[PDB]
Design a protein around this ligand. Sequence first.
Ligand SMILES: CCc1c(NC2CC2)nc(N)nc1N1CCN(C)CC1
Length: 154
Amino acid sequence: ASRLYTLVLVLQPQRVLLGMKKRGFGAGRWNGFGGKVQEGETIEDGARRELQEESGLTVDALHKVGQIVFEFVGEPELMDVHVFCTDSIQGTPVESDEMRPCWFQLDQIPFKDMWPDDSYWFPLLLQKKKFHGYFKFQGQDTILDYTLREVDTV
Ligand SMILES: CCc1c(NC2CC2)nc(N)nc1N1CCN(C)CC1
């Protein structure tokens, strides 16, 4: 089967907010904010909760921009990551136990220090296109297979 995750990108006209993950899965890489969706909350509410937990930020509106499915070799559950974007945020981002936030100019996104799949689908995010992606990983650095397409409905 698969398990629901969220990822939130705060994308403003000339900059994008990322967080350096300080512990847990994916520590040492910049990423959007998010995590597992809990029983009893919608996917979008889980995305808002994780954004607040990791950054302190709240948002007026979250927009669905993508879905990415991950297979990790030897792991039974696929990860079904629902990706959201927003321009307007409420608050100034602050460091949490999990994330250290930082703004990046759109031509200085730190892909070499992000999950490798981001290099593939982040351009579509920046181009405001909706997308469906699938990435097969062995370990945390090697993409074995992938698919990526633009979609009309996320
Ligand atoms: C570990 C899955 C993953 C990812 N690809 C990994 C397969 C290589 N790439 C990005 N940008 N985020 C990812 N997660 C989504 C949910 N987050 C909250 C945590 C991290």
